[PDB]
Amino acid sequence: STGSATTTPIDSLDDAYITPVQIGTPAQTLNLDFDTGSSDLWVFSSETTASEVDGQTIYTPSKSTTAKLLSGATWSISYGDGSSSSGDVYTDTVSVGGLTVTGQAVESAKKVSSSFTEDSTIDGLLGLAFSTLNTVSPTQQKTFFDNAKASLDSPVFTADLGYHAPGTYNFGFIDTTAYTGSITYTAVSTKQGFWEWTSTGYAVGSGTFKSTSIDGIADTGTTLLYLPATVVSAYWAQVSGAKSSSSVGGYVFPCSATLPSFTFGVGSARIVIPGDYIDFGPISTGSSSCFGGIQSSAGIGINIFGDVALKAAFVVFNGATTPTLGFASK
Template sequence: MASTVATNLNTLGRTTFIKNPSFKATPLNAYAKVLSKFCIIPSIEGPLKVVQQIEQQGAQTVLETVGLKKKGYAVKSHTLVKHNLATGQTGQVTAQDVSDAEYLAPVTIGSPGQTMNLQFDSGSSDLWVFSSEMPADQQQGVQSAGNSIFDPSKSSTFQRTHGTWSITYGDGSGASGNCGTDNINIGGITIKNQIIELADTASSQFLSGSESGLCGLAFPPLNTVKPTRAQTPMVNMISQSDIPKDSELFTCYFSGQSGNSYFTTGYIDHDACGGATPAYSPVDSSQGFWEVKSETACINGKAVSRSGNTAIVDTGTSLCLLEDSLLAALYGALPGAKIDHSVQGWVYPTDTPITSIPKLEIAVGSNYFTIEPEYFGFADLGNGYTYGSCQSRGSNFPFDILGDRFLCNIYAIFDQGKCQFGAVQRTSSGATTSGRPVDSGTESSTAQLVH
């Protein structure tokens, strides 16, 4: 099912992503961020661990919002802490231990407009911003980091509502506050009466970051507003007919280091497709995520069966998180690769020839998409090894997470109207394809992973 490629883009939205100049590809920080976001329990010993396994009470986590219990996973009130491998002592995960957002996008709120640089996150569903309702010392911290604060008293279109919101992450960090409605503008499209979640308090992990808040692009079940969940900007764009009926979608083009990254609403960029037809996969949105089937992978031409496996597509995560058995097969195909407990993940020799990097194809629905060699490594550790972009999804998390290092290899189409995810493969040579059909055959027999 293909969505229309728009020919008249005058009334449709395009936003250029800002490559965060403060972002550093620091392995443990990137891993800490995703462990914290999804309350993941690490399966590899290292400087991060989880303590306090008791039933969740109080503020909601992202996953508790939908009562996630898939494959035996139940949300607990556990806390991610730093763990000294030598002494066994633990300590708090601080702002310096968690990565900033890698990509930011300007969103204008209110009348007259106040511009906020937000992280566009397809792994959550809250639109929250730093606000003038925060304590003075927290506002000072936000401004010291170079970020903006939304002041609802300066907007003639802001209306107070009775809603409240609260998000708590796995490291104990969080933000909360009250709600109101206002007009917002994303890429030239104005959305009226959007619920804005105003932070009246936020933990230090947020205050020193490079973003002024977050724009959630997942489905409404993940939203934390009470007593009634807020609709996301995409849902409101659709209900207000801000985008064409046959293109109720947004797309993302992450370009790695080149800086030409962008986000569109209401149309598919024909140039990004390069003549290739997007391959679509049904999305299971019941738990709020962009969740697709991913029941096989292919390593150097050898298919690996992963019956029943699914993945979520998350623009708010830098790494790709996969189950441990698949990682063992992947890095087992790379000479010199090993688990380095000091960075709690897989590393491989930095001087590995590009021709020796395993070809990893990940199934999204019925098509494979390849992680190109230039995105196989996440960061040079400076000790002769490179930290891989694919790392462990832990012992309790039921999905793979396809983050930015996967998305840099495709043009991604999040079709909310048809509840499907589309992709076009982008290759190192600049060519584009529809991906490789899973049933197109492999170079050797299919293997079954041992769990």
């Protein structure tokens, strides 16, 4: 089998992407944030504290003839950005882009943190990291991909995120029309539960390529590109007036600037992030200070190839017995 679904930016900055997902019988369609950096499929629901729901579409398990309470199971998650959610668990039928999994763990939120409430466009998350990170207790549950994998034509999914435009998540096949040149594959460590890999270096604008190993994760659920402070300083040094602002929480730059591109290495291959992808707009409405899309990972504890990086590529998440990651230009 295969599946193919369009993923759409939630706003004009590409702060996140939402993908429609069918849950239950009859289908209840919720727009979920596909997150290769976590491993829980959780939704706003009829069980979510009413004051914490503000415009989201909710899953109502009592209206699904295929929903079953997973007795005794609870979940609780905290994300790197400080947001969190928790609740109980149902199993139900879940379909993405025509690909159906029966008995998928659908984690129903009883509580969500303010950042979730405040984002009306995101009805939940669909985790696509390794199932070892799934938070369900006392019986850990599998991701949608893990459940689908054996049925797929090939045990892969691909992320093709758009810049200020929709893109595509495919399951079970590689669309050879969706990228240019060849796909370069690179090794993955699953030891921390992430799609963790090592970039071979970087360049800033038309500058020379610096060969250096940068371990990090391919994370569709993180907006920005978080890299070591040395790398980030070298980038922003090429933007007149750019500075790290402790009060704002990262590098800012004059909105009148033209940003240079940023290149990262995948083996001997190179992915170029155009400068415009690195602009996250005014820090507050009407400001002439703009927020940068490349930020330091210092104090996160890990480098993160988030959407800023991934949207410059066609990315293969290869879930073969030994997983790997593939990147192509597009």
